[PDB]
Amino acid sequence: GFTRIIKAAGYSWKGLRAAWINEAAFRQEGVAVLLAVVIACWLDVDACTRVLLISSVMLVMIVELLNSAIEAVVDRIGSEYHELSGRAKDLGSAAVLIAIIDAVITWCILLWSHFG
Amino acid sequence: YSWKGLRAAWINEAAFRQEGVAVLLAVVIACWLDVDACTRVLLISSVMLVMIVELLNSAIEAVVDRIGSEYHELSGRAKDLGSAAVLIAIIDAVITWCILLWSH
Amino acid sequence: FTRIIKAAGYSWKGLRAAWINEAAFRQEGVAVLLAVVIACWLDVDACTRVLLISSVMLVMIVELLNSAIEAVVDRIGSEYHELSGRAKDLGSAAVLIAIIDAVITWCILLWSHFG
């Protein structure tokens, strides 16, 4: 079904709008993302450098989204159950950090060869 | 664990079959074109990422369904959030191929 | 600046937990620093050096998200008394594709370099 694509596309924009509204950390990163994305589109670099500059930052977005989905499950569980170790939320937090450290290292290495 | 989940996602998820095709297709096309290593890697890694995310999405959807048969605001929020991550990976793959191939 | 310090602590607590508990994570931690060392020491261009480190770091990201899902299934599987590891499977499947992707990357990158 071709309409199945427009359906799953609907479920997506719903989760993008809901991430931007409820999740605060998603908003700040989205700023640094669209900035960096634009910067990459105007930097005089090669298609490999440009893609690597854009994708590394967009990975932060993807990971944060998966982190928000996990938290929504812990919150769901937290409504029925009383105690929460919050260890699942701690692991999803680390994943986002590693994505950021990655994008930072990516941008530095790529720009210090470029500007260097 | 590994092969049990890839055969489960293939038999069940229709969008995963379309990505499995896409991954292998990407590997081929990346190998045919006269491009350098980094280009070939980016051509493949981008599509493989879409698959990696879609698997994590289906993993979450599996948990949401196992928690309760009942839809909650927070459970619906979970599914939609993961479904959005897949889109970004798809778009990221689209951007990747465009920047690389327009330059070629 | 108070929310940022709070989140980074959650990340250290998460990293320290994954290290102590998950053996596969310790192997991947070794892999990252080793990937970094190998990628840097080789007279290698920027994009390749990034891709050599990025690909291995991506593995660590998926392993962490996987272990996060595993923790949720185990909170359920403790209070639900019903175990259908459909989720734990799909998680490990993702990490595998991350690893395959990493090997391919290192292959194609290092193959072209020494070509």
List the domains of chain C with CATH numbers.
1-115 (1.10.287.3610)
Q: Read off the DSSP letter of residue C59.
A: H
C98 touches chain A (CB under 8 A): no
Which pair of structure tokens corresponds to residue B32? 């045919």
Residues whose CB falls within 8 Å of the CB of residue B41, separated by 6 or more in sequence, listed in order: C51, C55, C104, C105, C108, C109
What is the chain B residue with the closest CA to C82?
Answer: B66
Note the Cα A103 to chain centre separation in Å. 11
Phi, psi angles (nearest 5°) of residue B91: -60, -45
Which pair of structure tokens corresponds to residue C7? 């989140």
Give me the residue label for tokens 């720009």: A111
Are the C-beta atoms of residues B82 and A68 closer than 8 Å to each other?
Answer: no
CB atoms within 10 A of CB C36: 16
In chain A the first and final C-alpha atoms are separated, in Å, by: 51
**Resolution in units of Å:** 3.1
Rounded CA gap, C61 and C58, in Å? 5
A105: which chain C residues are within 8 Å (Cβ-Cβ)?
Answer: 50, 53
Are the C-beta atoms of residues C10 and A93 closer than 8 Å to each other?
Answer: yes
Has B72 been labeled as part of a binding site?
Answer: yes
Rounded CA gap, B88 and C90, in Å? 20
Question: Using what technique was this structure determined?
Answer: X-ray
Residue type, B90: I
C8 touches chain B (CB under 8 A): no
Residues whose CB falls within 8 Å of the CB of residue A17, separated by 6 or more in sequence, listed in order: none
CA distances from C85 to A57, A61, A71 (A): 32, 28, 20
B81 touches chain C (CB under 8 A): no
CA distances from A85 to A74, A96, B74, C13, C112 (A): 10, 19, 19, 12, 47
Give me the residue label for tokens 């590994």: B2
Q: Read off the DSSP letter of residue B34.
A: -
Radius of gyration of chain C measured on its C-alpha atoms: 17
Which pair of structure tokens corresponds to residue B21? 């095709």
